[PDB]
């Protein structure tokens, strides 16, 4: 369906969702950071925004929803973390782990 549906359907409280595209070094780094962690299977999802041939529309909606159109676009539940640098900052400070504990996402 619509870009809004594609995105909103995926974002869920308690779940880590990262919108990505192919050929995206920062997407791969975001994936590495999050895949290291003991997040429960099913509560981490990487979403290829190009797979339905509506890349631009999806980025347009991400821009509307979050203020930026770029991937990776990282969500912890409904919270938009932002991009890769944002995620790195949280990982390093320990805030990523604390947030995952609070929302019950660990295995
Ligand atoms: S909003 C979720 C739609 S679906 O994935 O069940 O098809
Ligand atoms: S994670 C994106 C690369 S960097 O800004 O953290 O150097």
Author numbering: -1 to 105
Text taken from the publication that reported this structure:
A high resolution crystal structure was solved showing the atomic interactions between Grx 1 and BNP7787. BNP7787-derived mesna moieties were observed as mixed disulfides on Cys 7 and Cys 82. Both cysteines that interact with BNP7787 (Cys 7 and Cys 82) are solvent accessible. The BNP7787-derived mesna adducts on Grx 1 are located at a crystal contact and within close proximity of each other (data not shown). Cys 22 and Cys 25 (active site residues) and Cys 78 were not modified.
BNP7787 (Tavocept, Disodium-2,2'-dithio-bis-ethanesulfonate) is a novel, water soluble disulfide that has been evaluated in oncology-related clinical studies, and interaction of BNP7787 with different redoxin proteins has been a focus of research in our laboratory. Herein, structure function data including activity assays, mass spectrometry characterizations, and X-ray crystallographic studies, elucidating interactions between BNP7787 and human Grx 1, human Prx 1, and human Prx 4 are presented. These data characterize covalent BNP7787-derived mesna moieties on cysteine residues of human Grx 1, Prx 1, and Prx 4 and provide information about the functional consequences of BNP7787-mediated modifications.
